[PDB]
Amino acid sequence: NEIIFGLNDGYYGAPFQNCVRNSYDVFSLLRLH
Amino acid sequence: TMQVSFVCQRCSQPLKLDTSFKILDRVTIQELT
């Protein structure tokens, strides 16, 4: 009697430096909101 | 290595924050909240 869910990245069940980028600045976030 | 604490929800890449986020003035908190 179990249910298994599925999200974007995979399936969830019941509990029994070189790659970093730049984040948006506060001004752009305010503009987006 | 570089320690990161956020990842882009759509871009799927680790992010680097801006100093203004750590120094958020109360105006931005009031507006975004």
Partner: peptide
């Protein structure tokens, strides 16, 4: 493929599947 660090929003909008 789920990076387990926090701040990863996990809401109903990202959910598209169900099974028993």
């Amino acid at each position: 493929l789920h990076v387990e660090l926090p701040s990863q929003q996990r809401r109903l909008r990202h959910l598209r599947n169900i099974a028993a």
